[PDB]
Design a protein around this ligand. Structure first.
Ligand SMILES: CC(C)(C)c1ccc(CC[C@@H]2CC[C@@H](O)[C@@H]3[C@H](O)[C@H](O)CN23)cc1
Ligand SMILES: [Zn+2]
Length: 1016
C-alpha cells in the first residue's frame, strides 16, 4: 500500500545533489548571454508544416510591501494598474494579462462598484485576465513553514472561488530567492498541473539549458513511483524583466520594452533605445526579434515558446498599455504574414502556454526528464550567494512561528462549536489568517524590506496575535463551563494567555503575575490546551506573588511543583558587567501538566502561609569574581556564591551535562555508565569585506572564516531543582541559557547585537562525530534533505536555510539541533554545526532595498539539542538524498513549534468550571498530526462542514518496541456526521466520497485533507 520512503532510492534523470557533485561552477564570459554561450539554430528547423508558436504573456510584478507598505503601494500604483487593466482588456478583446497576488486583487475588487465588478468577472470568464497561483502572496520558499505556505494559498484561492468562480492550476514564482520542492508537493495536492520558477543559480541554468532539461517532472526526493510529480518550467536567463525574457541578448530585448523611449523616465542600460514600430522599420525589427525567439526556443523541447512581457508594477498608465500593445500588434501582423519566419505569435496567458506544450507532448513531439532536489543556495552572479536573508530581521522570523501556532490553536479551539455572528469569531480569524499570510511574501519573512515596512508587518502581526487570543479565550470559557451556567459577553476577557517564550524574558515585560494573598484571593484557576492529537505532558510555569504556592488538579489531587526565582539580566553601565538580578516579590512556579489529545486540562494554584508539602525550592549559585549579595524576599533558600568553575548537572534519569567555567556546554553523558561525549558550544563573529562587494540584507559575503567572540570572565548563574535546572551566562551580545527537564536540553539565546556594525554573530557546536562533508537541513519544516559541503564553492554557498532543524551523523552517533525560528546555517568542517543568530550591516547590497540592516532589536531564539546513538537505526542507503528524524528529535521539534497554551482565569471566581475537555479524543500514533482543524461554515448553514489537514511524517526505526495507539478518524470527531469527503488541501474540490463516513489515516510523508458534514 504505502510507498517505502527509506529503502528505495528513486531513479531520476536529474538529482540535484548528484548534479552539484559533478558541476564545476566556472563563471566564464559567455558573450551577450553573459552566463551562457552563443546560441546557434538551424533556420530550416521550422517550416510550413512545423511552425514556432509564440505566446507573449503580459504581467505586472506587485510586491505586497518592500520599499513601500502594502497600503502605500496600493494607493500609489496597484489600484491604477488594476483599474487600467480592466478598461484596456475590456476595450481590446485580443489583449491578455496574468495576475498573481490575491491580497491586492481582493483589496481592489471590494472597492469597485457593481457595474465594474460585473465587467471584471466577464474578462476573467472569457480568459483575457488569468490568475496564476492565486495565493494571497508569492511567498518566500526558504524561511516559510509549509503550514503557512498552505495557509496563504488557501486564503487566496478561497477568495477566488467565491468571487471569481475560478481555481488556478498553473503557478508563477518569478521572484523568490531560490526554490523549494515543498511548493510542487503542496501544489500537486491542491489540483495543480503546472508550475514556473525563475531564481536558480546561474550555473544550474547553463547546465540544464545545454541538455534541454529546463522543463522537467519535479518529484519529491523520496518518491520512487513518481505520484508526487509536477510539470515545471524553469526560465533560462538572469531576470524576469523584458531585457532578460525575449532571448539571450539583453541589448536587443531591451529595444522591445516600449516603456523605455524616455517619456516614462526609463532607458536601456545597453545604450540602444526602443524605436516605435512603423511600416519602414517593421521588417528589420521583426528580423531581430524572431532571431532572439528562435535562439530561446533552442533551449526547450517543443515548438511552443513562452515570452513573458512585464516588470515591477508595470501596466500602470493608459499610455503604457497603448505603447506596449500597439507596437506588439504591428510586429505580430508582420511576422505572422511572412511565411519565411514560420512563426505564429500572439498575446497569451500562462495556462494557454502549458496547454499547448502538453498538446505537443501527447502528439509525441517531446518527452520530459524527471528531477528531484531543491534550488538553494541561489547566486545571481559571481560569488553573490543569497544566504544572508536566511537570518535577516530574526525578531520577525521568530514572530512568524509564534503566530503560526496561535492561528492553528485559535482555529482549532473555536471549531468545536458554531458561533453566533455577534461573537465576531469568523471576523477575528479572517484578520489573523490574512496578516500571517501577508508576511509570507518574499520581502516579509525574508527580512528584505525597508525599516518602516518591517514595522507595518510587525504591527499587523501584533493585531493578529490579539485576535487569536480573543478567540482562544472565548473558546476555553465555552468548552469548560457547565452549559446551563455559561453566560458569555463576547467582548470580555475571561482568560489571559501566558507565554514564557514570546516576546520573552529580557525582550518585553508582558507576562501577568498571579496575585494571591490571605487578604485578597486565596487561589487561581489556570487552563492548558494541547493542539496535538496525542496525550501530552509538559512542564509549564507561571509568575506568582508568593513562593508558598501549591498545585492541585480539578479532583483536588496534589501535583508536585517547583518554585524558582524570577531572574533578569542587566547590562550594568556602571560596573561594565552583564549580571542577573532577582525579584523579591515575584516567583516562578513550575509543574507538569497532562493534557488530552486536542484537549484542555484545568489546575488550581493556592497560597499557604508556609512551605507546602508538595512544592520544592531550587538552589541558586552565582559564579563570578567580586560578587555582591542577591536577596530574594520570602524565597526560602539563600543564593550561594563562588569563583568561576566547571560544573555538572543531571535532572531526573536524563542526561548529565558538563559546562566550562564560562557557562558553555562541553559534554553530554547519556546514561550512568556511558562516555562523556564532547559537545562544545562556541560563539563567533563574521565581518564584512573592506573592498569589493559588501554583505547586506540579501547577500552573505564574509571576510574569511569566523573569529571567536572574546568572552572575558563572564557571570554564570546555576539554578538546580528537582523538576528543572539551568545554566545561564551573560556573554557579549548574548545571554545564553541551557535548560534541563530530564530529556534533551532546551537552549535559549537572548540576542542583542547592540551597535556592533558590520558583524554577524554565529552559534557553533563542535563535536568529534565523523560526519566528513555531509549534513542535513530541513525544507519548510516538512522534510530533511542531504547536503554536501563543497570546498569548490565559497563559504557563503555552503550556508542553507534552517527553517526548523539540522543534523550531523556518523555510523554510531547523531547530533540534531531543532529551532523555534528560521535562521541560516551550515557544517563547515567534519563534526560541526553552526547557526547564525543576528546580523547588523551598514551597507546596501545592490538588490534594490537601498539601505543596510541597522534596525536590530533584542530577540529570544529557542532550540532543543538532541544527542543520540544511531547504530541500531534503519537509515537510507548512502545514495538516498533524504534523511529522517528519530522519535525524540521529532517530539523536541513539536515542543518548540506547538507547545501547550496557558490561560489564567481573569476574575476572582469561575462559576461552573470543569476539569477537562477532550478525554475521549483518540490518541493517535506519534508520527501523525492534525495540522489544521477549521470550521468552514457560518452558523446559518443547515449542513455544517469542518475541514482537517492530516500530515504523517516518517520517523526512523531504531528498536523501540511499538505500543498500540488508537486509530484517528477525523470525520467522527464531531457528532452527527452525515458525509465524509477527501478534498484538495485548500478544501475547494471534493475528490472522494468516503465509505462509512470514515477518513483513513495517511501514509508516511503524505498529507491529505478531509471535510466532514454534520446535520445541525
Ligand atoms: C540593479 C537593481 C536595479 C537595483 C536591481 C537589482 C535586483 C533586481 C531583481 C528583483 C528584486 C530582487 C530582490 C527582491 O527583494 C525585489 C522585490 O521583491 C521586487 O519585486 C524586485 N525584487 C532588479 C533590479
Ligand atoms: Zn518581488
Amino acid at each position: 500500500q504505502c510507498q517505502d520512503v527509506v529503502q528505495d532510492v528513486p531513479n531520476v534523470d536529474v538529482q540535484m545533489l548528484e548534479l552539484y557533485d559533478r558541476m564545476s561552477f566556472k563563471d566564464i564570459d559567455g558573450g551577450v548571454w553573459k552566463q551562457g554561450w552563443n546560441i546557434k539554430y538551424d533556420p530550416l528547423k521550422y517550416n510550413a508544416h512545423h511552425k514556432l508558436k509564440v505566446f507573449v504573456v503580459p504581467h505586472s510584478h506587485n510586491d505586497p510591501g518592500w520599499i513601500q507598505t502594502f497600503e502605500e503601494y496600493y494607493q500609489h500604483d496597484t489600484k491604477h494598474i488594476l483599474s487600467n487593466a480592466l478598461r484596456h482588456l475590456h476595450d481590446n478583446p485580443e489583449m491578455k494579462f496574468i495576475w498573481a497576488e490575491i491580497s491586492y486583487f481582493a483589496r481592489f475588487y471590494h472597492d469597485l462598484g457593481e457595474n465594474k465588478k460585473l465587467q471584471m468577472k466577464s474578462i476573467v470568464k472569457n480568459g483575457q485576465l488569468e490568475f496564476v497561483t492565486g495565493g494571497w502572496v508569492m511567498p518566500d520558499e526558504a524561511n516559510s513553514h509549509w503550514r503557512n505556505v498552505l495557509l496563504q494559498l488557501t486564503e487566496g484561492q478561497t477568495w477566488l472561488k467565491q468571487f471569481m468562480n475560478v481555481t488556478p492550476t498553473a503557478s508563477w514564482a518569478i521572484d523568490p530567492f531560490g526554490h523549494s520542492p515543498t511548493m510542487p508537493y503542496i501544489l500537486q495536492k491542491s489540483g495543480f498541473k503546472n508550475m514556473l520558477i525563475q531564481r536558480t543559480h546561474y550555473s544550474v541554468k547553463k547546465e540544464l539549458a545545454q541538455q534541454r532539461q529546463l522543463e522537467f517532472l519535479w518529484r519529491q526526493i523520496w518518491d520512487n513511483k513518481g505520484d508526487t510529480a509536477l510539470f515545471t518550467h524553469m526560465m533560462p536567463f538572469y531576470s524576469y524583466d523584458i531585457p532578460h525574457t525575449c532571448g539571450p541578448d539583453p541589448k536587443v530585448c531591451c529595444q522591445f520594452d516600449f516603456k523605455r523611449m524616455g517619456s516614462f523616465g526609463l532607458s536601456c542600460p545597453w545604450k540602444v533605445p526602443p524605436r516605435t514600430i512603423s511600416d519602414q522599420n517593421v521588417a528589420a525589427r521583426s528580423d531581430l526579434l524572431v532571431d532572439q525567439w528562435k535562439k530561446k526556443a533552442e533551449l526547450y523541447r517543443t515548438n511552443v515558446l513562452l515570452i513573458p512581457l512585464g516588470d515591477d508594477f508595470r501596466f500602470k498608465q493608459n499610455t503604457e498599455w497603448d505603447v506596449q500593445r500597439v507596437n506588439y500588434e504591428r510586429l505580430f501582423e508582420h511576422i505572422n504574414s511572412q511565411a519565411h519566419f514560420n512563426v505564429q505569435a500572439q498575446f497569451g496567458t500562462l495556462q494557454e502556454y502549458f496547454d499547448a506544450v502538453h498538446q505537443a507532448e501527447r502528439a509525441g513531439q517531446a518527452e520530459f526528464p524527471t528531477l528531484s532536489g531543491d534550488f538553494f543556495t541561489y547566486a545571481d552572479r559571481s560569488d553573490n550567494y543569497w544566504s544572508g536573508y536566511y537570518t535577516s530581521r530574526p525578531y520577525h522570523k521568530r514572530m512568524d512561528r509564534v503566530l503560526m501556532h496561535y492561528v492553528r490553536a485559535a482555529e482549532m479551539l473555536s471549531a468545536w462549536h458554531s458561533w453566533d455572528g455577534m461573537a465576531r469569531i469568523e471576523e477575528r480569524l479572517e484578520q489573523a489568517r490574512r496578516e500571517l499570510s501577508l508576511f509570507q511574501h518574499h520581502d516579509g519573512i525574508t527580512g528584505t524590506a525597508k525599516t518602516h515596512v518591517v514595522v507595518d508587518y510587525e504591527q499587523r502581526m501584533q493585531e493578529a496575535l490579539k485576535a487569536c487570543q480573543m478567540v482562544m479565550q472565548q473558546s476555553v470559557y465555552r468548552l469548560l463551563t457547565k452549559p446551563s451556567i455559561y453566560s458569555p459577553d463576547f467582548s470580555f476577557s475571561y482568560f489571559t494567555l501566558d507565554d514564557s517564550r514570546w516576546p520573552g524574558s529580557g525582550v518585553e515585560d508582558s507576562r501577568t503575575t498571579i496575585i494571591l494573598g490571605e487578604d485578597i484571593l486565596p487561589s487561581k484557576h489556570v487552563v492548558m490546551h494541547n493542539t496535538l492529537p496525542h496525550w501530552r505532558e509538559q512542564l509549564v510555569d507561571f509568575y506568582v506573588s508568593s513562593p508558598f504556592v501549591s498545585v492541585t488538579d480539578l479532583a483536588n489531587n496534589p501535583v508536585e511543583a517547583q518554585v524558582s526565582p524570577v531572574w533578569s539580566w542587566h547590562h550594568d553601565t556602571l560596573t561594565k558587567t552583564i549580571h542577573p538580578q532577582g525579584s523579591t516579590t515575584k516567583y516562578r512556579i513550575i509543574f507538569k501538566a497532562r493534557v488530552p489529545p486536542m484537549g484542555l486540562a484545568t489546575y488550581v494554584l493556592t497560597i499557604s502561609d508556609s512551605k507546602p508539602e508538595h512544592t520544592s525550592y531550587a538552589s541558586n549559585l552565582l559564579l563570578r569574581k567580586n560578587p555582591t549579595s542577591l536577596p530574594l524576599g520570602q524565597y526560602p533558600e539563600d543564593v550561594k556564591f563562588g569563583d568561576p568553575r566547571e560544573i555538572s548537572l543531571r535532572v531526573g534519569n536524563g542526561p548529565t551535562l558538563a559546562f566550562s567555567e564560562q557557562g558553555l556546554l562541553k559534554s553530554i553523558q547519556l546514561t550512568q555508565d556511558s562516555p562523556h561525549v564532547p559537545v562544545h558550544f562556541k560563539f563567533l563573529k563574521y565581518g564584512v569585506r573592506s573592498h569589493g562587494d559588501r554583505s547586506g540584507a540579501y547577500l552573505f559575503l564574509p571576510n574569511g572564516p569566523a573569529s571567536p567572540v572574546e568572552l572575558g570572565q563572564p557571570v554564570v548563574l546555576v539554578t538546580k531543582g528537582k523538576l528543572e535546572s539551568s545554566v545561564s551566562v551573560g556573554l557579549p551580545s548574548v545571554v545564553h541559557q541551557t535548560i534541563m527537564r530530564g530529556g534533551a536540553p532546551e537552549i535559549r539565546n537572548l540576542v542583542d547585537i547592540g551597535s556592533l556594525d558590520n558583524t554577524e554573530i554565529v552559534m557553533r557546536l563542535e563535536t568529534h562525530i565523523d560526519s566528513g562533508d555531509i549534513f542535513y537541513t530541513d525544507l519548510n519544516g516538512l522534510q530533511f534533505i542531504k547536503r554536501r559541503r563543497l570546498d569548490k564553492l565559497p563559504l557563503q554557498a555552503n550556508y542553507y536555510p534552517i527553517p526548523s532543524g539540522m543534523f550531523i551523523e556518523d555510523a554510531n552517533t547523531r547530533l540534531t539541533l531543532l529551532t523555534g525560528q528560521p535562521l541560516g546555517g551550515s557544517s563547515l568542517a567534519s563534526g560541526e554545526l553552526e547557526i547564525m543568530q543576528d546580523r547588523r550591516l551598514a551597507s546596501d547590497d545592490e538588490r534594490g532595498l537601498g539601505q543596510g540592516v541597522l534596525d536590530n532589536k533584542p530577540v529570544l531564539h529557542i532550540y532543543r539539542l538532541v544527542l543520540e546513538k544511531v547504530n541500531n537505526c534503519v537509515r537510507p542507503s548512502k545514495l538516498h538524498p533524504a534523511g529522517y528524524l528519530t522519535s525524540a528529535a521529532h517530539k523536541a521539534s513539536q515542543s518548540l513549534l506547538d507547545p501547550l497554551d496557558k490561560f489564567i482565569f481573569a476574575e476572582n471566581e469561575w462559576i461552573g468550571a470543569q476539569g477537562q475537555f477532550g478525554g475521549d479524543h483518540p490518541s493517535a500514533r506519534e508520527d501523525l498530526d492534525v495540522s489544521v482543524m477549521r470550521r468552514l461554515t457560518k452558523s446559518s448553514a443547515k449542513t455544517q462542514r469542518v475541514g482537517y489537514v492530516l500530515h504523517r511524517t516518517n520517523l526512523m526505526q531504531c528498536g523501540t518496541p511499538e505500543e498500540h495507539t488508537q486509530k484517528l478518524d477525523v470525520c467522527h470527531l464531531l457528532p452527527n456526521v452525515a458525509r465524509c469527503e477527501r478534498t484538495t488541501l485548500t478544501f475547494l474540490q471534493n475528490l472522494e466520497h468516503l465509505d462509512g463516513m470514515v477518513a483513513p489515516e495517511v501514509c508516511p510523508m503524505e498529507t491529505a485533507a478531509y471535510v466532514s458534514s454534520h446535520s445541525s
